[PDB]
């Protein structure tokens, strides 16, 4: 079987509001822009 | 019509009923009636039959009119508002009747042409007994039932198909959201069906069905609906019939309910090829096999066809709070052995949808007994906190985990309406982790399972999902184990599921810890007696050449014991007749266990004391796996004798010397003092313990200054119980707000002698209710034989809706209390902070409740009680309830309640555990039968090492002649010990599982005369060791060892891999009746 | 002061549903009739 | 007063009738978000008569119409409806 | 687990059972955090 | 009122009524209740 006998790593049930509002920062161009998708939109813009 | 209405014409058919009435309230079998009794009295529609629980047999002779040569289906309709069970002429059960919910019996196309007869075994009780006004009210013994239908029918099959179509569409109209377009599509189609149907034109039925096809699709008429979109199902439907082995009816009626449910389900399986049915309890299979062997043969063929899936793996669907740990292991051992013997199946899902609470070590016992899945729905009855998740990992005290699912539609008796199918996915509580719900449909809580109407509705729900696609994709042809396989596959072997660590607390039915006190006391006594009997039987079979281990007698005793642990009998929520059955068979188990133990003892060279031999040669049997250095026991009616043992632990001999630390009872300024070397107990003339002073640590233990209790410990309080709905099941949190303190007692000194000092309190509970409390202190030689201040209450209990409890304020400050539960400790809060803690106002414990701070603690030991409450320096033991609703005389009568207050100068440790075991022990007076065979072999199996490791059980293996030793860590730390096997030649010692299948081989040393296998246990581990005597990331699903070499993977399922050694052993049984194993390398 | 320094008696917040449905049995003539108000309505009815 | 229907027969004084539809998502400048696609069918006012809604998307009230982003979102809404099937089945290649 | 706090010990859960325990994924302690079973334990001491 | 009432003690009835006075006031036993705030009634009751 793949189901381990021993569980020493508790997993919490996800809080709905926290994990739903986490979704907003993947495409946000705000404070965490450098760690999320908008940082790789461009391929070296020139102006 | 009767045949008397048709004499001139041999063409218009009839129905003739001859009724035979069983004289007593007995339940004769088919062969004891048909062919022997006379069916003479004639019955007709409108007749009335029998008092409650009465049995009537009907010979039904039918003549179909020849104009019914057409009408490809002919129905016999039977509606007497009670139980059915059509019998064929050859005695074959064919079809059950249950009031109006199940009335039709399809004539089997073989005796429609021939004017044939059959039989109906009517039982004069409802699906849930009689009731007397309410379902759970005490049975009405004078109920009478009226026959309202005994008709032959030739149903219009297209009309009934249209009725099912319209019912599903109308439910979609009523249930779907008001902005859902499928709701209005359904309403539009239903309206056209009405505008189209004319009762005078039968082709309108067919065009109405064609109209409904726009909503249900074209495949609803067969099992082809489920073959579409069958790869992304969200709801998995499985048929189920929960038959309470005894809830509101005797065991004898359960025997008939089993057969009439399963024969019905088997004929339904014949008609519906996609339909699958799970039933759990192995004892019910055994009962069917005893009563109807041919039905059992047919049943095992169905099990082979993967219809009729046996599940659960336990003897009965038992309570998990009250029985001790060995009882839970025995439930699994007996159930799994029965299922492996009768079928080729080993259950992998623990099925327990109706049990009141789940103890913290159930996942570990499940993993030890081969089950890694858990199904339950009872936690939906939590009336304070909704359980956070529907699918989760349930982790035991030791860390062992099962994967648990709670069917989101909070029932195991669903109806397959669109609301049930919808709720099976949309009230799933943790849908972000998995989007699969189990739909458990049928009629249960004691009775007969799903009807063909429910399968038609399921087919139409699937068709709606296929066609207009708002209902969930429902799958019907999958087993429960395949459902769990899907969950494990989607969740990375369950790694992403939320965890629950410890006990699953049921915030309901708490009164079940205390109600039926006699049965619970008998259960504990019987468990301890069975342990002792198996221990001495193992010793006698090992050391006596002419004694065979009584496997058959022990198996019978365990079957009865495990039967009485059923999740409604043991918690104390049955009608009075159930206990008029259960208490005597429990007493018989106790008596026969004692007889077995005495046979083994006689084989070992001893005999009962017989009260004629002189005291100096009296011995005492210990059976605890450690030296109880001294025991004080009565020999005559009032003579106390001290038995000591210096080295050998099994046998204690009567002592000559006086005690080093005698106990004394004297008087003071109207106060009574019970004094020891260790404790000073100051008892008011009221009977309240004014002071409990530890003499070594010169500290007071009581703290009467803070808290609500200012007048003494051991305070008896009578609370007004009056729960909200279920009197025998429930106690409410508001029950503590209204009470009477029993403080009118009088104290007298019963004894003051050196062995045991003791006062007697005579407490008037009320008129009709009295109690005599004895408070005793024992002297000792060593502090390890002390059990604290002992209390023996003799209660004449005749109260109504009262709850007698006893309180001890204890000068301990801690945020948690430790309660001994099966194979370990559960920690419960003492503070009521959140609603989770508010829900735990009364909790279940096995033999002690400990309340300790860093420097001191107080344990309350008991020998018959299971309800406790520790909240803010107040420890309260629940003593007696007086419910009335299922049983009007539940606990009325005499009760002996023993409990001890054991103060100790540290946090909880092994001294409390040993004191609780000793407090619960039955030390038996023995006499050497001779002096040539009086050897003390009672130390053959010892456990030496950390005292928190308990050798809890010694047994002989079911299969061979090996000895099974159950060992467990009791206090929660990784510990080291050694099994010492002294007077024996040990071929080998292996670590095995709960089913006694070898897991690994252990290194056994060889000392001067013993063997000394060193063992290491994890924090709360339950280990099993098989001693064979004589001279001689994929893990295997039998031995839970990582498979490094080639493995064997079962293709029939998803998560069963066996190693090469276990494959050669043929140890690969699992929920696959016909397993196919492919070899896997590397 | 009357406010005690030490609190060794935890009090739980009342569950709304349980304590609201407890109210129904004070005037109920059902199972607990003998323990509630309807038991003292009469003063020795005669028939 | 909310108008009773989304799809109806509008009859003149003389009795001449046209068939009128009012896009249930109450705009002609929708954005093709999942809310617009959902509302195009689920706030239809007489769904018992017909279960078809028109989604009129673009930027208007004087200006320039739909953007390619809206067409990408429409394709993904259709894909969601095809795959997990809660969003309405949306069609793009049909004329009014 | 036992966390030293001002003038004593605060016990926090280690299991994430309910939302109360889920909320305590990081906790405050003064100078040591202790994780002990019945027979053994490990303290993590710190100075900042 | 429930915690106070005992069917064996009839004075508990009177103290339960005294407890209820905190919610119903003191005038409910006669027609004097209607003589208070009787100028701004919102509901007018008539038997029928
Ligand atoms: Zn049940
Ligand atoms: Zn398999
Ligand atoms: Zn193996």
From Swiss-Prot, chain B:
Any single GO BP term: oligosaccharide catabolic process
Enzyme class label: hydrolase
Pfam families referenced in this protein's UniProt entry, alphabetically: Alpha-mann_mid (PF09261), Ams1-like_1st (PF22907), Glyco_hydro38C2 (PF17677), Glyco_hydro_38C (PF07748), Glyco_hydro_38N (PF01074)
Matches recorded under InterPro entries: Ams1-like_N (IPR054723), Gal_mutarotase_sf_dom (IPR011013), GH38_C (IPR041147), Glyco_hydro/deAcase_b/a-brl (IPR011330), Glyco_hydro_38_C (IPR011682), Glyco_hydro_38_cen (IPR015341), Glyco_hydro_38_cen_sf (IPR037094), Glyco_hydro_38_N (IPR000602)
Compartments where located: Cytoplasm; Vacuole
Catalysed conversion reaction: Hydrolysis of terminal, non-reducing alpha-D-mannose residues in alpha-D-mannosides
Record's GO cellular component terms: cytosol; fungal-type vacuole lumen; fungal-type vacuole membrane
Cofactor: Zn(2+)
GO molecular function term, any single one: carbohydrate binding
Active site: 354 (nucleophile)
Alphabetized SUPFAM superfamilies for the sequence: Families 57/38 glycoside transferase middle domain (SSF88688), Galactose mutarotase-like (SSF74650), Glycoside hydrolase/deacetylase (SSF88713)
Disulphide-bridged cysteine pairs: none
Record's keyword terms, sorted: Cytoplasm, Glycosidase, Hydrolase, Metal-binding, Vacuole, Zinc
CC cofactor note: Binds 1 zinc ion per subunit.
Binding site for Zn(2+): 242, 244, 354, 567
EC number: 3.2.1.24
Similarity remark: Belongs to the glycosyl hydrolase 38 family.
PANTHER family in the cross-refs: ALPHA-MANNOSIDASE 2C1
Function: Degrades free oligosaccharides in the vacuole.
Name this protein carries in UniProt: Alpha-mannosidase
Species of origin: Schizosaccharomyces pombe (strain 972 / ATCC 24843)
Curated annotation (Swiss-Prot), chain D:
Localization (cell): Cytoplasm; Vacuole
Protein family according to the UniProt entry: Belongs to the glycosyl hydrolase 38 family.
Function: Degrades free oligosaccharides in the vacuole.
Protein name: Alpha-mannosidase
Gene, per the UniProt record: ams1
